[PDB]
């Protein structure tokens, strides 16, 4: 059945003629998930990844050809390109070079490079921005709570793949960029802390990031009129540790309750140098309330 579903998923997958054969991908996926659930043979689960990888490339080619119809349908060679982005399985090279660059579909270039693999720091950091700003783009129609949830699901899914390999998951950059987006969009201060918690990022290493991002004294938080924001992040992160202490290993926790008190003393020296606005007063109260719990966690 797989060797005829391949002959309805080779030449044959979106449709690449455009719309009936995505049923053949989704149905071949259903038949291969049914095969492996009845008879867990290697090869019928090996062919399942072939189909689910083909399924995202298939959706990218649909994102391309409908966007030619939705933007460029008064140009003559869009009929040529529609009949071409019909009849065959185009690889990521064709989809970029023959269609998404000649028509200049930036939305689809971003869609292609989200799929086009991963390779070491600068390109890895661009691709994590591309993945974040695509999911921020294509969610624009939804409320902040739903867009938080969508971006959480994306970054928790891909983070559960790449966080095991710290060349492909640049944690420190992803935290800075997500907090710069939260700081812009006016989302919750618990957000990036929740996303990294639900990936499973070790909470001491998560603190090492916000600690150094605060110590950078980045002009962004100042330019967005939220020069306190990363201290509110550190407060929510450390209150989340204090009222669930299981998030630090039962040997390391005593080393960490020092480092949290040492750092909270540092942030309280910082805060008590600032102009004593109601926010600086409240956050000085929050950090002394946090201190007055950490003093019992030791």
């Amino acid at each position: 059945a797989a060797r005829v579903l391949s002959r309805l998923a080779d030449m044959h997958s979106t449709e690449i003629s455009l719309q009936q054969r995505l049923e053949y991908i989704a149905r071949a996926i259903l038949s291969a998930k049914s095969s492996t659930a009845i008879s867990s043979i290697a090869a019928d689960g090996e062919f399942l990844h072939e189909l689910e990888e083909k399924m995202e490339v298939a959706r990218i080619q649909l994102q391309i050809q409908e966007t030619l119809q939705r933007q460029y349908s008064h140009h003559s060679s869009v009929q040529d390109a529609v009949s071409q982005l019909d009849s065959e399985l185009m690889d990521i090279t064709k989809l970029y070079g023959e269609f998404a660059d000649p028509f200049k579909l930036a939305e689809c270039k971003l869609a292609i490079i989200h799929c086009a693999g991963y390779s070491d720091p600068i390109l890895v950091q661009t691709l994590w921005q591309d993945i974040i700003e695509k999911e921020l783009s294509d969610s624009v129609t939804l409320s902040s709570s739903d867009r938080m949830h969508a971006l959480s699901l994306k970054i928790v899914l891909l983070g559960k793949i790449y966080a095991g390999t710290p060349r492909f998951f640049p944690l420190d950059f992803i935290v800075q960029f997500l907090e710069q987006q939260v700081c812009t969009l006016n989302w919750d201060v618990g957000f990036v802390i929740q996303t990294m918690n639900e990936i499973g990022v070790p909470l001491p290493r998560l603190l090492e990031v916000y600690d150094q991002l605060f110590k950078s004294r980045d002009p962004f938080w100042n330019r967005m009129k939220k020069p306190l924001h990363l201290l509110d992040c550190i407060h929510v992160l450390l209150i989340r540790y204090v009222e669930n202490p299981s998030q630090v290993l039962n040997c390391e926790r005593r080393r960490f309750t020092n480092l949290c008190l040492d750092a909270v003393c540092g942030y309280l020296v910082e805060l008590q140098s600032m102009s004593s606005s109601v926010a600086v007063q409240a956050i000085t109260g929050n950090f002394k309330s946090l201190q007055a719990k950490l003093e019992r966690l030791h």
Binding site: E53, V57, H75, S76, S77, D80, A81, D91, I92, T93, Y96, G97, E98, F99, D101, P102, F103, I112, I113, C115, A116, G117
Partner: peptide, 19 residues
């Protein structure tokens, strides 16, 4: 194919009739 290859050098004019 999953692999991506950029090749700006020779493309087909999307905006244009075929020769």
């Amino acid at each position: 194919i999953k692999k991506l290859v950029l090749k700006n050098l020779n493309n087909s004019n999307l905006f244009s009739p075929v020769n």
